Amino acid sequence: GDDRELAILATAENLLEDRPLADISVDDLAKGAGISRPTFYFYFPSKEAVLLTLLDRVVNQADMALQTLAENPADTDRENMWRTGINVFFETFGSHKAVTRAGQAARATSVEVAELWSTFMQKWIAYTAAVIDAERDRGAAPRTLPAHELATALNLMNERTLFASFAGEQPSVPEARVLDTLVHIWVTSIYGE
């Protein structure tokens, strides 16, 4: 029961490694999960709902990890504290590249996918802007741009740059260099006069 659901999600994630959602049928997902077509419909209304569930699981994983770090500050310097947050994405989405690719292709057409990602980005941009505000109040950062506008651009940069790196787009920063590249831009733009 919870078994068949997990097998349907595992099948979709496996299949999305080789082709887009448009080339996967409900019959392919059911066949991979060892169930019939109408049994599939008991668990999901459509192959699009399977993708949404996979995206919801990955986004909550990242969010829970970031909550853990926000509750458990590392005894390290400021550059390494920003690095630890960025690395959540690097590690969580970078462990589910096919799902990430499929979430981005769906965003153009799917209101549900676009809304799910927006809700989460609003949260992480708010947390970012709150940290920057805290750092300015402590005298560690200068009051330059509005913190919430700076946080919005830096989080958008990381969304698009990690995507390109994970995809091997041309142009992209190589995946083994992208964390240091992003952390440089965050620390200079937040602490730089």
7, 10, 26, 69: which one binds ligand 841 (CB under 6 A) = 69
Q: Which is nearer to ligand 841, 85 or 141 (CB)?
A: 85
Q: Which is nearer to ligand 841, 35 or 150 (CB)?
A: 150
33, 154, 166, 179: which one binds its own copies (CB under 8 A) = 154
- Nearest Cα to Cα of residue 102 among 45, 54, 64, 35: 54
81, 104, 127, 130: which one binds its own copies (CB under 8 A) = 104
Calpha distance 11→27 (Å, rounded):
11
Q: Which is nearer to ligand 841, 30 or 103 (CB)?
A: 103
DSSP letter string, 6-48: HHHHHHHHHHHTTS-GGG--HHHHHHHHT--HHHHHHH-SSHH
Torsion of CA 171, 177, 182, 187, to 10 degrees: -140
Query: Please, what is the minimum distance in Å from the beta carbon of residue 5 to its own copies?
Result: 28
Query: Please, what is the minimum distance in Å from the beta carbon of residue 78 to its own copies?
Result: 14
With CB under 5 to 8 Å by kind, the binding choice for 84 among its own copies, ligand 841, none is ligand 841
Q: What 3-state DSSP class applies to 146?
A: coil
Calpha distance 124→89 (Å, rounded):
12
DSSP letter string, 49-97: HHHHHHHHHHHHHHHHHHHHHHHS--SS-HHHHHHHHHHHHHHHHTT-H
Residues that bind ligand 841 (CB under 6 A): 55, 58-59, 66, 69-70, 82, 84-86, 89, 93, 100, 103-104, 107, 113, 116-117, 121, 124, 127-128, 155, 158-159, 162-163, 166
Residues that bind its own copies (CB under 8 A): 104-105, 108-109, 118, 121-122, 125, 144-146, 149-150, 152-157, 159-161, 164, 169-174, 177-178, 180-182, 184-185, 188-189, 192
